[PDB]
Design a protein around this ligand. Structure first.
Ligand SMILES: C=CC1=C(C)/C(=C/c2[nH]c(/C=C3N=C(/C=C4\NC(=O)C(C)=C4C=C)C(C)=C\3CCC(=O)O)c(CCC(=O)O)c2C)NC1=O
Ligand SMILES: *[C@@H]1O[C@H](CO)[C@@H](O[C@@H]2O[C@H](CO)[C@@H](O)[C@H](O)[C@H]2NC(C)=O)[C@H](O)[C@H]1NC(C)=O
Ligand SMILES: CCCCC/C=C\C/C=C\CCCCCCCC(=O)O
Ligand SMILES: *[C@@H]1O[C@H](CO)[C@@H](O)[C@H](O)[C@H]1NC(C)=O
Ligand SMILES: *[C@@H]1O[C@H](CO)[C@@H](O)[C@H](O)[C@H]1NC(C)=O
Ligand SMILES: *[C@@H]1O[C@H](CO)[C@@H](O)[C@H](O)[C@H]1NC(C)=O
Ligand SMILES: *[C@@H]1O[C@H](CO)[C@@H](O)[C@H](O)[C@H]1NC(C)=O
Ligand SMILES: *[C@@H]1O[C@H](CO)[C@@H](O)[C@H](O)[C@H]1NC(C)=O
Ligand SMILES: *[C@@H]1O[C@H](CO)[C@@H](O)[C@H](O)[C@H]1NC(C)=O
Ligand SMILES: *[C@@H]1O[C@H](CO)[C@@H](O)[C@H](O)[C@H]1NC(C)=O
Ligand SMILES: *[C@@H]1O[C@H](CO)[C@@H](O)[C@H](O)[C@H]1NC(C)=O
Ligand SMILES: *[C@@H]1O[C@H](CO)[C@@H](O)[C@H](O)[C@H]1NC(C)=O
Ligand SMILES: *[C@@H]1O[C@H](CO)[C@@H](O)[C@H](O)[C@H]1NC(C)=O
Lengths: 49, 50, 336, 291, 50, 50
């Protein structure tokens, strides 16, 4: 990516809740040990575009 | 918003399956109406805050 | 023209399954409803029912019940449910006093003899027994408490026979003026009014869909299927979703698991003692890209959170292109 | 047949602090990785729990008829199984039905029955002569039992009831409560090695039984075993030395609690709402940490 | 100017129907009643529902 | 907000003590739930306006 140094530091300094938007059905079906909140939101109709 | 799905809202239970398995559609419809009203209220509160 | 969010991708249940506990004995209807000697109301008999099938259609042939009132469950769902711990409280009372066997009632029977809660799930069954409990000359075997210092608590029993002191002078353990024996005997005779005829009452009390169960309806179990959206019925708990193997270790007293949202996510299969996780089979947003309906009737569909590099799409069609926003079906990619 | 105990040396009731003890699972539902708030009859944190310890060095064997204020938290620290039951009731003199829980070295027997309890019941062990070993020789509890409306006798078993020397090797915690005609018992047995008051820690009490006794309970007392042998003089009322077991009694009160279910579904921590301002904020914000 | 004890009725009175509106029966011991009237008459059994 | 405490919200009365004195826990729970839902909605309206 063409980010500068300062842009890289800024991006690393704030953590995004999503970390991407492609969370497939198989992923939420397979991670039954770990309860991510995003899977619950997606299963209850709450999507982040 | 996800956490607010654990509220009776005056219904006998907060789970649709429990209501539909204990009560037939005869008396289940009023309970499901109460749940629908409450959850729609929760969604409206979320949308207003947004 | 534009892009419109539609309902998330839905998968309909392919089939239905039923998993009830492995039992075949019929519940003791004969030993409860057909008993020769019912107890007195003041000392009411509680019997535990477990590990049996609550078919209850055998009662149609012989017994007809004057009153049958269920609380916490519809009469029609009793065949589709199974009950955790079942207690039958049996006794005999006056005909006029059957109305007192109900939640939140007052009266001699409700106060001093047999109190019911209102957080009460169960069924009260009452039937006339004038031909059994009534004999010429008066059947004085059935007693009831007529005096008590305070109301009984729910499902409390008091079998004492201490002299009741009504006035100020102590009774000192002997009868007298303002000193009555607390128990009085019903006088039941066959030629006597319907409201003052003996009635046999059985109160069945139980819980539903909260703990392991051993008394189940006459539903026939079905073979278990995994990794397919099905209409399951686990111990009377209906629903829909995909069942998968689980790493959760339920305690011996636990039957169901629940989320922060209070919905069921895990269940101990009653036939084989394993924990199955339940996951809804509808998941993933869907959008419709359309020009104006006047312009054309064509549309592209953007299935978010699916990889197109048995897909969860309505129709694969042609022109399947994977964008960072999801799988776009019906649109032709162009390098420009 | 019963006999009173005469060699008694009693002191005022010692008090100790319940260090966040007496928490039980409020329902039979599996919950994992969740903060759940529930209001119920809980033992308040840092409560005064009365302490009764039976030792010989002083000859104390205390067992008073304590009240039962809508719930009791019992906790026995022991190594030789001295505490082996309880008597619950309202008058305990055969005028009313009473509950008896007993472990008489072969079965655990529970009876709801009109007992004529003795003044100071006990379960005297004696060093038998048929074989040189420690086993149950006396059952001095009640004189009569009529109109007897419950029975939950278990299968036979055997237990090592020999009087050992050392620190307390077992801590058995119980929560009894009488609700809507149901006697609910929650239990938890944990191994400890201590010779002092209740240990620091946290242990959720799992449900044990839900007896349908349907009686009125306002008082109760503990059934202790009496260590008898040929190395002591005296008669039955005096030829006896108590064991080396202690127990603690606290009273449940209606409180709101915030429990934490971990990944494996065991309650690992709890917060007593209405204990102090810090716990009050934790209660208000629904979290175990406050910024 | 009453004390509505009504436990004296248990000795000899047996009521075929006793239905209360606006008050729970269990709370009738805990209350005071302001303007109490008793409307007395005789009908046939089939009309008691009316 | 204070004035809005004088609404039944479908309950038998706007006074909690009145409900708990007439009805018992048997029936008072639904009425108290209705009052709770109404007063919570009133609080939500106040917070949104704020
Ligand atoms: C008082 C009534 C009473 C209760 C509630 C009870 C419950 C109980 N005792 C157990 C074992 C056990 N029970 C005891 C002994 C005792 N356990 C006690 O609660 C007491 C007071 C003693 C002392 C007499 C021991 C020592 C074990 C484990 C065996 C061992 O490690 O030695 C268990 C584990 C399951 C099993 O037995 O396999 C339970 C649930 N036993 C009883 O007798
Ligand atoms: C349960 O038992 C207690 C004690 O027997 C009862 O409480 C007593 O009630 C009478 C009523 O006049 C009082 O005179 C006593 O002072 C009370 N004693 C105590 C210790 O409270 C209680 O009423 C019983 N509960 C029920 C539902 O019957
Ligand atoms: C002279 C009448 C005065 C009435 C005063 C007003 C209210 C008192 C409350 C109830 C009175 C009716 C009690 C009927 C007895 C209980 C019947 C039963 O369920 O067994
Ligand atoms: C109950 O008793 C009657 C008369 O003996 C009998 O006809 C009937 O079959 C019995 N019903 C059951 C379920 O046992
Ligand atoms: C259930 O019952 C049937 C018939 O008794 C038996 O074949 C089957 O093995 C049982 N399954 C389990 C898990 O017990
Ligand atoms: C749709 O297309 C027609 C041309 O056939 C045009 O007349 C009309 O204005 C268009 N309407 C809209 C809303 O675009
Ligand atoms: C799944 O989607 C991501 C993002 O589009 C992509 O990087 C990845 O290659 C896809 N998986 C496979 C096997 O291609
Ligand atoms: C578009 O670009 C890709 C790689 O850059 C190439 O493989 C493909 O042939 C191109 N298609 C057209 C129509 O130019
Ligand atoms: C001593 O024992 C007798 C019966 O065994 C009993 O009546 C008496 O109350 C006991 N002594 C005391 C002070 O209680
Ligand atoms: C009760 O607890 C408080 C605080 O621990 C203590 O100050 C008080 O002494 C205790 N009561 C008695 C009688 O010891
Ligand atoms: C006491 O132990 C004996 C065996 O030693 C047993 O038979 C009996 O059941 C126990 N007591 C009771 C009341 O069960
Ligand atoms: C209680 O015991 C006495 C004497 O044993 C007896 O007269 C009475 O009938 C009994 N009552 C009950 C309900 O068992
Ligand atoms: C939870 O259970 C797993 C095994 O099922 C185990 O590996 C892990 O150590 C346990 N963790 C805790 C905190 O108990």
């Amino acid at each position: 990516s063409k980010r500068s140094f300062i842009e890289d530091l800024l991006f690393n300094k704030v953590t995004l809740a999503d970390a991407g938007f492609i969370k497939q059905y198989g992923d939420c079906l397979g991670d039954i040990a770990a309860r991510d909140l995003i899977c619950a939101q997606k299963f209850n109709g709450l999507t982040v575009l | 918003l996800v956490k607010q799905l654990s509220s009776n809202f005056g219904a006998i239970s907060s789970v649709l399956n429990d209501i539909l398995s204990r009560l037939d559609k005869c008396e289940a419809e009023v309970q499901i109406d109460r749940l629908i009203t409450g959850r729609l209220q929760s969604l409206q509160t979320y949308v207003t805050q947004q | 023209k534009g892009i419109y969010q539609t309902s998330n991708f839905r998968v309909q249940p392919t089939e239905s399954i039923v998993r009830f506990p492995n039992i075949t004995n019929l519940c003791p209807f004969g030993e409860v409803f057909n008993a020769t000697r019912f107890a007195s109301v003041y000392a009411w008999n509680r019997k535990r029912i477990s590990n049996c099938v609550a078919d209850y259609s055998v009662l149609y042939n012989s017994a007809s019940f004057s009153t049958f009132k269920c609380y916490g469950v519809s009469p029609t769902k009793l065949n589709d449910l199974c009950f955790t711990n079942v207690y039958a409280d049996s006794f005999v009372i006056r005909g006029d006093e059957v109305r007192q066997i109900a939640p939140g009632q007052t009266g001699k029977i409700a106060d001093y003899n047999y109190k019911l809660p209102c957080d009460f799930t169960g069924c009260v069954i009452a039937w006339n027994s004038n031909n059994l409990d009534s004999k010429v000359g008066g059947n004085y075997n059935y007693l009831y408490r007529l005096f008590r210092k305070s109301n009984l608590k729910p499902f409390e029993r008091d079998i004492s026979t201490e002299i009741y002191q009504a006035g100020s002078t102590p009774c000192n353990g002997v009868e007298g003026f303002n000193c009555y024996f607390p128990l009085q005997s019903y006088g039941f005779q066959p030629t006597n009014g319907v409201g003052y005829q003996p009635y046999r009452v059985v109160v069945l009390s139980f819980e539903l869909l909260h703990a392991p169960a051993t008394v189940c309806g006459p539903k026939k179990s079905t073979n278990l299927v995994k990794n397919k959206c099905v209409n399951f019925n686990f111990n009377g708990l209906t629903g829909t979703g995909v069942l998968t193997e689980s790493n959760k270790k339920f305690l011996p007293f636990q039957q169901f698991g629940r989320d922060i949202a209070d919905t069921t996510d895990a269940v101990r299969d009653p036939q084989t003692l394993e924990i199955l996780d339940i996951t809804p089979c509808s998941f993933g947003g869907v959008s419709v890209i359309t020009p104006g309906t006047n312009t054309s009737n064509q549309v592209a569909v953007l299935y978010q959170d699916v990889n197109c590099t048995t897909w969860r799409v309505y129709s694969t069609g042609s022109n399947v292109f994977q964008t960072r926003a999801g799988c776009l079906i019906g649109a032709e990619h162009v390098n420009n | 047949q019963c006999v009173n105990l005469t060699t008694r040396t009693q002191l005022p009731p010692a008090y100790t602090n319940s260090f966040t003890r007496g928490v039980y699972y409020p329902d039979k539902v599996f919950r994992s990785s969740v903060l759940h708030s529930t209001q119920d009859l809980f033992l308040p944190f840092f409560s005064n729990v009365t302490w009764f310890h039976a030792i010989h060095v002083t000859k104390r064997f205390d067992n008073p008829v304590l009240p039962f204020n809508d719930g009791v938290y019992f906790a026995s620290t022991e190594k030789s199984n001295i505490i082996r039951g309880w008597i619950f009731g309202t008058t305990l003199d055969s005028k009313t039905q009473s509950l008896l829980i007993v472990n008489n070295a072969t079965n655990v027997v529970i009876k709801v029955c009109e007992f004529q309890f003795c003044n100071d019941p006990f379960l005297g062990v004696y060093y038998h002569k048929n074989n040189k070993s420690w086993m149950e020789s006396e059952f001095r509890v009640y004189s009569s039992a009529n109109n007897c409306t419950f029975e939950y006798v278990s299968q036979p078993f055997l237990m090592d009831l020999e009087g050992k020397q050392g620190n307390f090797k077992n801590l058995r915690e119980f929560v009894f409560k009488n609700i809507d005609g149901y006697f609910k018992i929650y239990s938890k047995h944990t191994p400890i090695n201590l010779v002092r008051d209740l240990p620091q820690g946290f242990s959720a009490l799992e449900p044990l039984v839900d007896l349908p006794i349907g009686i009125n309970i306002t008082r109760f007392q503990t059934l202790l075993a009496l260590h008898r042998s040929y190395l002591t003089p005296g008669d039955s009322s005096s030829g006896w030395t108590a064991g080396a077991a202690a127990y603690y009694v606290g009273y449940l009160q209606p409180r709101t609690f915030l429990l934490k279910y971990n990944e494996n579904g065991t309650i690992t921590d709890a917060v007593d709402c209405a204990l102090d301002p810090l716990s009050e904020t934790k209660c208000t914000l629904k979290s175990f940490t406050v910024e």
